[PDB]
Design a protein around this ligand. Structure first.
Ligand SMILES: CC(C)[C@@H](OC(=O)[C@@H](NC(=O)CCC[C@H](N)C(=O)O)C(=O)S)C(=O)O
Ligand SMILES: [Fe+2]
Length: 329
């Protein structure tokens, strides 16, 4: 069979406080996990994930086909040319099983300077009718800020782990301009499950989504308690255990770029499982003009032979490339 990946559980609660020594001990754990498989579970994170799952289930099981067309991104509805990232991503019965709803920073309002300039990757969120989905928009916007708060604390741990001051990444992760996104993904139970919606890896493993590196600084993920993720290690693809009480954390390719691959973006994939489940990632993205000078924590002078890359350039190009490689979700 497949061996279990080493995915440690790290108590990240000291990253919310003022005990500097305790924060360094958490940073060492992040360093070790980032240098090994590239994944860890953040525990004692303070977020009510059971309520998140209940509110998301109420949304996914009540939205109708009519509402999905009315909220659809431009890949599914040509009338919505401004919706590249934010909105509904439809399933295609008999062909594509997954469906999802993506939303961005709630501060991207019609009057935001980047929305007025029509800067790529910035969009105003679209929401279903309040009478049909009472409390959903308010819950989802508050969830964005709850997971933003956890992600800021995690970024202080990564900064300390790399020998930097704790605001090294967090000073570029701000409420007024972050490009971070929440995706509410529904994987359905289907009987018969269409073979056209199942991909096959080179090793024969049935998949819902092929191998990739994440387009993010870090990825902060809540998932149902149904095992499905695998990570490629030197010993082959290994199964990541499920844990619906914690957040699964990993680095994206922007972190690999900035650290000269000291903290690699782990290659991973999603196995096909015939089960009704949820996958709720928060992609930690910086601001459009955020530029961090690349460095190398394995070199005495800390210098790297990589060129500075703005986060906006990285993100626009990365999202398109992932769709070309692994298909429109
Ligand atoms: C992480 C989970 C495993 C999940 O996978 C993802 O969400 C898939 N991300 C993308 O498609 C990028 C989506 C970007 C989003 N539209 C945006 O504009 O910011 C990855 O596999 S990462 C799942 O399939 O369960
Ligand atoms: Fe991923």
């Amino acid at each position: 069979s497949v061996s279990k990946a080493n995915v440690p559980k790290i108590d990240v609660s000291p990253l919310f406080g003022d005990d500097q020594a305790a924060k360094m001990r958490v940073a060492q754990q992040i360093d070790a996990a980032s240098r090994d498989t590239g994944f860890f579970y953040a525990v004692n994170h303070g977020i009510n994930v059971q309520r998140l799952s209940q509110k998301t289930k109420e949304f996914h099981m009540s939205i109708t086909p009519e509402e999905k067309w009315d909220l659809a991104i431009r890949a599914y509805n040509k009338e919505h040319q401004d919706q590249v990232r934010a909105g509904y991503y439809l399933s295609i019965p008999g062909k594509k099983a997954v469906e999802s709803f993506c939303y961005l920073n709630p501060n991207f309002t019609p009057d935001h300077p980047r929305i007025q300039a029509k800067t790529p990757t910035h969009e105003v969120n679209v929401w279903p009718d309040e009478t049909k989905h009472p409390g959903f928009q308010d819950f989802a916007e508050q969830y964005y800020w709850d997971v933003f708060g956890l992600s800021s604390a995690l970024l202080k741990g990564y900064a300390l782990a790399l020998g930097k001051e704790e605001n090294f990444f967090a000073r570029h992760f701000k409420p007024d301009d972050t490009l971070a996104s929440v995706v509410l993904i529904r994987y359905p139970y289907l009987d018969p499950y269409p073979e056209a919606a199942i991909k096959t890896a080179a090793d024969g493993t049935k998949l819902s989504f092929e191998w990739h590196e994440d387009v993010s600084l870090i990825t902060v993920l809540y998932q149902s308690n149904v095992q499905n993720l695998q990570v490629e290690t030197a010993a082959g693809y290994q199964d990541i255990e499920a844990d619906d009480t914690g957040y699964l954390i990993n680095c994206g390719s922007y972190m690999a770029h900035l650290t000269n691959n000291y903290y690699k973006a782990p290659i991973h994939r999603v196995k096909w499982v015939n089960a009704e489940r949820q996958s709720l990632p928060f992609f930690v993205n910086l601001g459009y003009d955020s530029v961090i000078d690349p460095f190398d924590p394995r070199e005495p002078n800390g210098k790297s032979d990589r060129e500075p890359l703005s986060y906006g350039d990285y993100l626009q190009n990365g999202l398109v490339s992932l769709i070309n490689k692994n298909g429109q979700t």
